Write an enzyme that holds these catalytic residues in place. Structure first.
Site, short mmCIF file in Angstrom:
data_model
loop_
_atom_site.label_atom_id
_atom_site.label_comp_id
_atom_site.label_asym_id
_atom_site.label_seq_id
_atom_site.Cartn_x
_atom_site.Cartn_y
_atom_site.Cartn_z
N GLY A 1 46.77 22.62 33.58
CA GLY A 1 47.63 22.42 34.73
C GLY A 1 48.86 23.26 34.63
O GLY A 1 49.96 22.75 34.49
N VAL A 2 48.69 24.56 34.74
CA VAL A 2 49.84 25.43 34.61
C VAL A 2 50.43 25.98 35.89
O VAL A 2 51.43 26.70 35.83
CB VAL A 2 49.51 26.56 33.69
CG1 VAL A 2 49.02 26.00 32.37
CG2 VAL A 2 48.44 27.41 34.33
N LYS B 1 48.37 27.48 38.69
CA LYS B 1 47.53 28.51 39.31
C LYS B 1 47.67 28.40 40.82
O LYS B 1 48.03 29.37 41.50
CB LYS B 1 46.05 28.30 38.90
CG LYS B 1 45.13 29.50 39.11
CD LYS B 1 44.34 29.45 40.41
CE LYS B 1 43.27 28.37 40.39
NZ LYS B 1 43.82 27.01 40.59
N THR C 1 49.97 26.77 42.63
CA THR C 1 51.33 27.13 43.03
C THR C 1 51.57 28.64 43.06
O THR C 1 52.19 29.17 43.97
CB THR C 1 52.38 26.48 42.11
OG1 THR C 1 52.19 25.06 42.06
CG2 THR C 1 53.77 26.77 42.63
N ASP D 1 38.00 25.48 45.04
CA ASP D 1 38.19 24.13 44.54
C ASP D 1 37.84 23.07 45.59
O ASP D 1 38.31 23.14 46.73
CB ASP D 1 39.64 23.91 44.09
CG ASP D 1 39.79 22.72 43.16
OD1 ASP D 1 39.49 22.87 41.96
OD2 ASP D 1 40.18 21.63 43.63
N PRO E 1 60.74 29.30 36.66
CA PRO E 1 61.47 28.12 36.20
C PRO E 1 60.71 26.82 36.52
O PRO E 1 59.88 26.79 37.42
CB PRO E 1 62.77 28.22 36.99
CG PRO E 1 62.27 28.69 38.33
CD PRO E 1 61.26 29.77 37.95
N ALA F 1 62.92 20.51 39.36
CA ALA F 1 62.87 19.06 39.27
C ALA F 1 61.93 18.55 40.36
O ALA F 1 62.27 18.62 41.54
CB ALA F 1 64.27 18.47 39.45
N1 LIG Z 1 57.42 25.85 38.13
C1 LIG Z 1 57.21 24.51 38.44
N2 LIG Z 1 58.22 23.61 38.30
C2 LIG Z 1 58.04 22.31 38.59
N3 LIG Z 1 56.87 21.83 39.03
C3 LIG Z 1 55.80 22.65 39.20
C4 LIG Z 1 55.93 24.04 38.91
N4 LIG Z 1 54.71 24.61 39.18
C5 LIG Z 1 53.88 23.69 39.59
N5 LIG Z 1 54.51 22.46 39.62
C6 LIG Z 1 53.93 21.16 40.00
O1 LIG Z 1 52.54 21.15 39.65
C7 LIG Z 1 51.76 20.82 40.80
C8 LIG Z 1 50.73 21.88 41.05
O2 LIG Z 1 50.01 21.99 39.84
P1 LIG Z 1 48.85 23.06 39.98
O3 LIG Z 1 49.43 24.39 40.33
O4 LIG Z 1 47.79 22.59 41.12
O5 LIG Z 1 48.14 23.12 38.55
P2 LIG Z 1 46.89 24.10 38.62
O6 LIG Z 1 47.32 25.42 39.06
O7 LIG Z 1 46.22 24.18 37.16
O8 LIG Z 1 45.83 23.48 39.66
C9 LIG Z 1 52.66 20.62 42.00
O9 LIG Z 1 52.50 19.31 42.52
C10 LIG Z 1 54.07 20.86 41.48
O10 LIG Z 1 54.85 19.69 41.66
#
Ligand SMILES: Nc1ncnc2c1ncn2[C@@H]1O[C@H](COP(=O)(O)OP(=O)(O)O)[C@@H](O)[C@H]1O
Ligand SMILES: Nc1ncnc2c1ncn2[C@@H]1O[C@H](COP(=O)(O)OP(=O)(O)O)[C@@H](O)[C@H]1O
Lengths: 302, 65, 302, 65
Positions: A26-27, A29, A31, A55, A266, A269
């Site tokens: 959950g990094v 991707k 976003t 997905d 970054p 919050a």
């Molecule tokens: N840089 C960040 N700072 C704070 N929260 C983040 C950040 N990036 C993603 N998130 C959080 O993670 C979630 C999205 O996770 P996600 O991108 O779907 O993981 P993955 O890419 O493995 O599917 C969002 O709900 C958001 O709140």
């Protein structure tokens, strides 16, 4: 003569047509995938875009707060970014109700599923008479989504030394084409590229290292790494043990990939959802985030 | 002189590198660690190339009187 | 009549002989794997233990700060916990210098590699005349390490309807035995069990959910989840956005798995390496961590 | 009455559930979300069982005059 720590070069590019975004764990991707789109969509108004996801959990719909389906809709609040959510695994499973030689050959199922996607896209550009200049792939979370690129070379390593008991050896030579026509493209550093998301912790740096290798073999262009969810804890309004470690790895990554566009995002919050925040957060892909001056913009997000 | 001095130099070198990589924190020296690994992944193939280079030259002398 | 939020039940157990530890992403599988061992090794002095790892990066050696190899050594500072680091992929690759029907049959390579491990173990109990009452597996980070459990059922679904051009159909029936003798054991909730590590974030909760399912299919006993790297930020000496989210998921997990032993571990400042800290941290697998009273013990670690 | 009322009830139910699951935050309702999923994974098989239940009863009447 160092490399810019951001994606400006990519978001500015006019040559690319395909951009892949991926990373396990959950990094962010998703976003990042959304961020690259919006950023690409805002910096080039003329061009029309398409952000697609395989997905099944419908993540892009979660990310924007909208209901995007199999029909290429346009992001509400945008003008050249359109999102399309499709499930190939299900589609390819209906015109299959045998594939025996698929499980037999590693890489078939993928190519198949992929092409099943492209189709659903050219179909959208027809009923919509709207041509997409660039598409962004929110690569599947698990599985080697695009392994088919080896399909060509492998189908040759089992033809000169291997065999309607033959109508099979035909609609197969017909495929080692669709795939090589494609592979030829994705293997063009000017048309397509891959961006890897990763959190700056050990196990994650490993995986992304693995991946980078995997893409290297496929002869896909890997040039950028976006390290997401960083702290920069020392630039907060006031007093951190994790930032010490993260910083540790960050230095390592800069040393490992000197020719790479290493982007540091970054950790805001709370969630980063909807166009208003996504756009706000995404700009740090273009002009690199500065913990000092930009310390506030990361608190405007919910 | 090839299927020997080569198949060894490397297998050896690899073997030599392998033990060294196991003397460093994959954690405090991820930088170096992964570099070495990338290397071993290379040798791992050219050794698997000499394994077919040495095997094509056999199916060769026996398929040709 | 709720379930205890810890592993005491397991660490106390006298019946178990096999315990598997796993979880993708850098969530602490290794740390947990070591922790369960030490904890198991301290609570039952009579019994002799073995913590084994397949990972090539030699992680257990990193975790303890010692150099454990292919030879079952004993942890320096311990008395009944012994660590063994082996690479099956390499071993099985030498007595293979064909496997054509291996890549053909999904699950062969694994079973093979596994048995290659067991061997290296019974071999240690011979030259050492020392019998291990319980073993702990630091399941490989990527790949379905133990998928062979389906091997039996699948080898049957391709025998009644499928075929030294037959010395193959023999040393194969000979395997569907070694595997079923084993599977029968691991499928005994009293002898073997699996513990899943996971960080309390979405993508990680997914994966571990997936996994749990995978183990369910194999008919392996999944009963405990250790959620690692938690903050409990509000119990610090003084003032957090992530803890809000984590807490969010924690509530969800408690609701999803009501019959499960959900263990909450704390995120200490910096590495948790070496017996002195590992032991110190591990005790929170037995008596659950209390943010209030135990807030200090998490700052004694480096 | 079986290979129909069954193969539908479910495929239908599944289909019905599928759209519903796509009306909830896999994030704010992971609890429910994953529950539903686990379910669909069940129906996904018993439907794939009726697909062989209905196919064994064909290779049956034709292998038996
Ligand atoms: N840089 C960040 N700072 C704070 N929260 C983040 C950040 N990036 C993603 N998130 C959080 O993670 C979630 C999205 O996770 P996600 O991108 O779907 O993981 P993955 O890419 O493995 O599917 C969002 O709900 C958001 O709140
Ligand atoms: N609860 C924790 N709090 C703080 N640091 C931790 C915790 N658990 C693990 N770590 C850190 O993570 C590292 C081990 O990560 P690891 O367990 O090997 O990830 P994985 O299990 O996926 O291989 C150690 O160096 C340690 O510093």
């Amino acid at each position: 003569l160092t490399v810019e720590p951001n994606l400006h070069s990519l978001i500015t590019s006019t040559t690319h047509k395909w951009i892949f975004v991926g990373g396990k764990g959950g990094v962010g991707k998703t976003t990042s995938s959304c961020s690259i789109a919006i950023q690409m969509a805002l910096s080039q108004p003329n061009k029309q875009f398409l952000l697609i996801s395989t997905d099944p959990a419908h993540n892009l719909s979660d990310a924007f707060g909208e209901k995007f389906g199999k029909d290429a809709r346009k992001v509400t609040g945008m003008n050249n970014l359109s999102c399309m959510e499709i499930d190939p695994s299900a589609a390819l499973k209906d015109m299959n109700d045998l594939a025996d030689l698929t499980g037999s050959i590693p890489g078939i199922d993928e190519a198949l599923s992929f092409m099943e996607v492209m189709k659903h896209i050219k179909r959208q550009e027809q009923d919509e008479g709207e041509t997409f200049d660039t598409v962004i792939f929110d690569t599947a979370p698990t599985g080697h989504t695009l392994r088919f690129l080896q399909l060509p070379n492998t189908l040759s390593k089992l033809l000169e030394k291997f065999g309607g008991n033959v109508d099979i050896s035909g609609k197969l030579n017909e495929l080692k084409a669709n795939v090589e026509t494609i592979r030829q493209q994705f293997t063009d550093p000017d048309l397509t590229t891959f961006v890897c998301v990763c959190i700056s912790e050990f196990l994650s740096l490993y995986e992304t290292e693995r991946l980078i290798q995997e893409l290297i073999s496929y002869d896909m262009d890997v040039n950028s790494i976006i390290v997401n969810q960083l702290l920069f804890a020392e630039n907060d309004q006031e007093h951190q043990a994790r930032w010490k470690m993260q910083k540790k790895y960050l230095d390592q990554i800069d040393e490992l990939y000197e020719d790479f566009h290493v982007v540091k995002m970054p950790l805001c919050a709370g969630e980063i959802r909807g166009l208003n925040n996504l756009t706000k957060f995404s700009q740090f892909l273009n002009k690199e985030y500065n913990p000092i001056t930009d310390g506030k913009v990361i608190y405007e997000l919910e | 002189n090839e299927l020997s001095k080569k198949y060894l130099a490397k297998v050896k070198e690899r073997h030599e590198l392998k033990e060294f990589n196991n003397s460093i924190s994959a954690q405090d020296n991820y930088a170096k660690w992964t570099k070495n690994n990338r290397k071993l992944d290379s040798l791992d193939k050219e050794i698997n190339n000499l394994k077919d280079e040495i095997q094509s030259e056999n199916k060769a002398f026996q398929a040709h009187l």
